[PDB]
Amino acid sequence: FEAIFGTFCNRLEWVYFLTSGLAAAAHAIKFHDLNKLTTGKMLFHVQVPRVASGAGLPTSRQTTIMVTKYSEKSPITIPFELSAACLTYLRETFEGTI
Amino acid sequence: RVASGAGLPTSRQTTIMVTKYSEKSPITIPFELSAACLTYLRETFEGTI
Amino acid sequence: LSQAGAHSLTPLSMDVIRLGEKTVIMENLRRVYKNTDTKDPLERNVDLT
Numbered sequence: 001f002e003a004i005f006g007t008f009c010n011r012l013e014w015v016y017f018l019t020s021g022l023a024a025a026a027h028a029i030k031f032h033d034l035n036k037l038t039t040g041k042m043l044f045h046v047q048v049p050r051v052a053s054g055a056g057l058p059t060s061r062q063t064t065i066m067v068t069k070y071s072e073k074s075p076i077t078i079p080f081e082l083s084a085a086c087l088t089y090l091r092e093t094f095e096g097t098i
Numbered sequence: 099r100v101a102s103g104a105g106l107p108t109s110r111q112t113t114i115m116v117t118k119y120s121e122k123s124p125i126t127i128p129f130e131l132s133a134a135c136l137t138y139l140r141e142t143f144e145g146t147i
Numbered sequence: 148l149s150q151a152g153a154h155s156l157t158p159l160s161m162d163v164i165r166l167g168e169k170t171v172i173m174e175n176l177r178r179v180y181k182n183t184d185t186k187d188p189l190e191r192n193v194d195l196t
Contacts, residue, residue, distance in 0.1 A: 009113070013178060021161050021174040078101040080176045081110045100185050109184075 042069040 017023055044067045053059045099108055162173040180187050 013181065015179050019159060019173045020176075022176065024172050027148070027152060029148065074103050076101045076103045078099070078108060079110050080112060100180075100183050102185065 040071045044068065 027054065046065050046067070048063050049064065050060050050062055099112070102108060164171050164173060176187070176189060
């Protein structure tokens with residue numbers, strides 16, 4: 001027999017998130033149990049700054065106020081199929097022709 | 099390829115096929131040699147300088 | 148949240164700009180979207196009536 005050869009190509013422009021400067025905007029965190037969580041939250045406590053009133057003017061009463069921040073889900077998914085013949089070929093180790 | 103959270107499908111098939119060809123372009127150069135120059139080249143009459 | 152990500156750090160060269168004594172980082176994101184069908188999010192269509 002004689003084969004009809006093809007050619008593979010493998011080189012790619014590898015890229016990393018931490019290597020990029022886009023990471024400077026982000027504070028990356030690897031939390032392994034992330035799928036379990038529903039919705040995080042961050043309460044913020046803020047007393048109002050005050051300034052002394054002059055004579056004949058209504059006073060600036062103190063007023064505590066608070067807010068809350070949350071988070072948005074960003075699921076992502078990619079697939080990679082493998083040939084069923086190539087997949088079953090991976091298992092048993094033939095010991096015949098080189 | 100790139101992963102996406104969008105519902106639009108991403109390709110399931112890594113690595114695209116490419117067919118190419120080897121287009122030969124041969125060249126040819128004549129160069130004449132006079133029969134005199136050949137007959138004097140191999141022979142040596144040894145008659146005069 | 149602030150405790151994470153500290154410890155190890157490594158240098159890497161990048162261009163920068165100085166605006167108002169602030170030092171904004173510069174970036175070119177085209178390198179990741181090359182050889183992919185997907186559109187660049189930095190690009191966006193904008194309608195005007």
